[PDB]
C-alpha cells in the first residue's frame, strides 16, 4: 500500500550524512521545484528498503513487446530478476500480440508475470505511441501501488530500486542531459498539442523510462493520448512521438523525483562518462 | 486544500536548470533518504509560488507567548507580516495565558490571527516541554478543519528574510544553527538509555532544532502526540531530557524521517554565531533576551 503516513524506523547504523561534505558535487542533485535527482552517493538504500518495506510496497513494471520485439523479453526479465526491487513485491505486466512467445522465466519470491495479449499496430510509431492508451486504460489501480512503465529492447545491469518511487517520476535521456533547452528535440510546431516553445523547458525526458503512484501515471498517459489524438485529429504527428508529449506532461506536472541518466542509457552509442558512477538500465543492441 | 494529484502550471519563463553546472556545491542539497534540504539557491520561487497557490493552500503557524514572552510577539508578528509566506493564506495562532496582551497588529489580505487562551505553567522547562501537548490538543480541535500546513515556532524570533512555500511538505525539521556542521557524537542529544528521548552515540542523521519545525496537519498533530506521549512516559520514570521537547523531537524524527530539512538560514543567532559563508540568507533568527 501506499501509506498515509511517515513510518517508524528501527535502530539503524549507517555514516552520518556531511552538511558541509556533498559527495556529488559534479551534477544537480535537485530541480528548482525541490525534487531529487537519482544519482548514486544520494540514497542510502538501506533507509529507502526500510521505509518502503514497511508499506508493503506493491511495484508493476509493464513492458511492451510486440512483433519481433517479444525476442529482447528473456534478457530483460532475467536481468530485472537479479537487479529490479529485489525483496520488494513485483508485478511484471507484459503486453504482446504473441502470448505463446513469453519466455518461460524463473522469478523470485514475491514476484510475478502477467501477459496482456495486445493489437500490433503496422506503423513502429503506432505501437510505441499507443502505449500511453494501453497503459491509461489498463486493473493495475486495484493490484499495484507504483508502476513503472520502460521500454524492452533493455537490460539491468546494476540495481534499479525503491529510491525511483514517488508520485511521478522521469528520466532523463541520455542524449541530451547536458543539453540546453533550445537544443532539446521537443515538438517545435504550434500547431502540435506537445509544442513547447525555445525559452520554455525544464529538462529532456526519455519516453522509454517513466513512472510513478498507479493515479499519476494514469493521469500521465491518459492525457498524452488524448493529446496524441487531438495532433491526429488536425493531421499532425509530434517529432517524437510519445515521447514528445511526455515532455509537454512533464514541463506542466512537474515531477516529484527526476531520474538520473545512470537508470536509462546505451553505452554503445555513449561510452560511460565520469558523470555516471552506475550504468544501471541499457540498451541492447538493435 | 493539499491536492490528491500534482498541478498543472501555465508557461513561465526562467532560468534553465543545468544538470552538469549545481550552483550549491558547499552544502549537502538531499538527505539519503532523498529529501531536500532547503538552501538558497536549491529553489525557483515562482514555480513553487505557482504549485501552491494554485491549490489554495492555507499555513497555519503556531507560537506560544505565555508570561513574560507576551512581549516578543509585537515583532514577531510585524516581521512575519513581511516575510511568512506572502501572498498565500496565512493562520497564525497565538497560545498564551494573556489575551488581552496580545499586540493589535494590522494583517495582510488573507491573513487572520487567531489567540488560543492556555494555561501557564510554572517551570520553563514545562513550558517549552508542553507545546506538544498543546499543539497536538488543537490540531483535532482547530487546525485539521482550518489549515493545511503547520509551522511551529519559538516567539522569541523575528523574520528578516523571505520565509515561503519552500519549506511546506508532509513533515520537515530544521537543522540546528549549533550543530550544522558537527558530528553526531557532538550533537546535544539525550544520552540516558533510560529516557525515551535517548539516541547513542552511533545514531543520528542531524541535530534539529526544537524551535522550528512543521509539515501537513496529520503528520505535526502525530509528532506533537508522539513527543508528549514520551516526555509523559520520562515524567512516570522520573526522568527529564537534556533539551526537554527538542529532545523528543529529535528522536522522533531520527525514526520518522522529515520529507524536507530546512538549512539553519531558516534558524540562525547571528549575535552568537555570526554569519558564516554557507548562509547566502538569515530568514529567521533569534532576538536578542
Ligand atoms: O515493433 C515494435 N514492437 C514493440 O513492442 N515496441 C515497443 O516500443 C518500444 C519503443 O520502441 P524502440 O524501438 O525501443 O524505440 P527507441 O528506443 O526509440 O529506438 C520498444 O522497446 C518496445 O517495448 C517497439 C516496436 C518498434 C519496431 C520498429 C520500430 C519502432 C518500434
Ligand atoms: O516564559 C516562557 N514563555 C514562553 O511562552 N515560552 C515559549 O517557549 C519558547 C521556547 O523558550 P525559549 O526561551 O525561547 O528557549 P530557547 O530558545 O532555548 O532560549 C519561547 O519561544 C516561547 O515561545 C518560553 C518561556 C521561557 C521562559 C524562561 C525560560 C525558558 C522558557
Ligand atoms: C547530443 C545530441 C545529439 C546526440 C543524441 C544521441 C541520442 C539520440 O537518441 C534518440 O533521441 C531521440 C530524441 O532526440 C529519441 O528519444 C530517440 O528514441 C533516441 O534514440 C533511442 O535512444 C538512444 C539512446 C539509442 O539507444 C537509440 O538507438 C534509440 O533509438
Ligand atoms: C558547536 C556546539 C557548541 C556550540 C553550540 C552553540 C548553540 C547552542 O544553542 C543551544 O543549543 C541547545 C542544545 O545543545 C538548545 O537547543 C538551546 O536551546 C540552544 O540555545 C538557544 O538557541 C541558541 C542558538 C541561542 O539563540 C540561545 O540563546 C538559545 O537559548
Ligand atoms: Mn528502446
Ligand atoms: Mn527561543
Redesign the interface.
Known amino acids: 500500500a501506499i501509506g498515509?503516513?511517515?513510518?517508524?524506523?528501527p535502530?539503524?547504523?549507517?555514516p552520518?550524512?556531511?552538511?558541509?561534505?556533498?559527495c556529488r558535487?559534479?551534477?544537480?542533485?535537485?530541480?528548482?521545484?525541490?525534487?531529487?535527482?537519482?544519482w548514486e552517493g544520494?540514497?542510502?538504500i538501506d533507509?529507502?528498503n526500510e521505509?518502503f518495506r514497511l508499506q508493503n510496497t506493491t511495484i508493476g513494471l509493464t513492458v511492451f513487446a510486440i512483433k519481433k520485439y517479444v525476442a529482447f523479453l528473456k534478457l530483460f526479465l532475467e536481468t530485472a530478476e537479479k537487479h529490479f526491487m529485489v525483496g520488494h513485491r513485483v508485478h511484471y505486466y507484459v503486453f504482446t500480440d504473441q502470448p505463446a512467445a513469453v519466455p518461460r522465466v524463473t522469478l523470485g519470491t514475491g514476484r510475478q508475470l502477467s501477459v496482456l495479449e495486445v493489437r500490433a499496430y503496422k506503423r513502429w510509431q503506432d505501437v510505441s505511441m499507443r502505449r500511453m492508451e494501453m497503459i491509461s486504460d489498463f486493473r493495475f489501480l486495484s493490484e499495484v501501488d507504483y508502476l513503472v512503465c520502460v521500454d524492452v529492447d533493455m537490460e539491468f545491469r546494476d540495481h534499479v530500486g525503491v529510491?525511483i518511487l514517488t508520485?511521478?517520476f522521469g528520466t532523463?535521456h541520455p542524449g541530451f542531459?547536458?543539453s540546453?533547452?533550445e537544443a532539446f528535440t521537443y515538438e517545435r510546431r504550434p500547431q502540435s498539442q506537445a509544442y513547447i516553445?525555445k525559452?520554455?523547458?525544464?529538462?529532456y525526458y526519455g519516453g522509454a523510462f517513466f513512472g510513478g503512484s498507479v493515479?499519476?501515471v494514469q493521469?500521465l498517459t491518459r492525457a498524452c493520448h488524448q493529446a496524441m489524438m487531438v495532433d491526429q485529429a488536425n493531421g499532425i504527428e509530434a517529432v517524437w512521438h510519445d515521447e514528445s508529449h511526455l515532455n509537454k506532461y512533464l514541463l506542466?506536472?512537474?515531477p516529484?523525483?527526476v531520474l538520473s541518466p545512470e537508470y536509462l542509457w546505451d553505452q554503445q552509442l555513449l561510452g560511460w562518462p565520469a558523470?555516471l558512477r552506475k550504468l544501471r538500465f541499457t540498451a541492447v543492441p538493435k
Do not use: C
Open positions: 498515509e503516513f511517515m513510518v517508524s524506523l535502530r539503524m547504523v549507517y552520518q550524512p556531511k552538511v558541509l561534505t556533498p558535487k559534479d551534477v544537480l542533485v535537485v530541480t528548482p521545484w525541490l525534487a531529487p535527482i537519482v544520494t540514497f542510502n533507509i529507502l521505509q529510491e508520485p511521478l532523463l542531459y547536458g540546453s533547452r516553445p525559452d520554455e523547458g525544464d529538462f493515479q499519476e493521469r506542466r506536472h512537474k516529484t523525483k558523470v
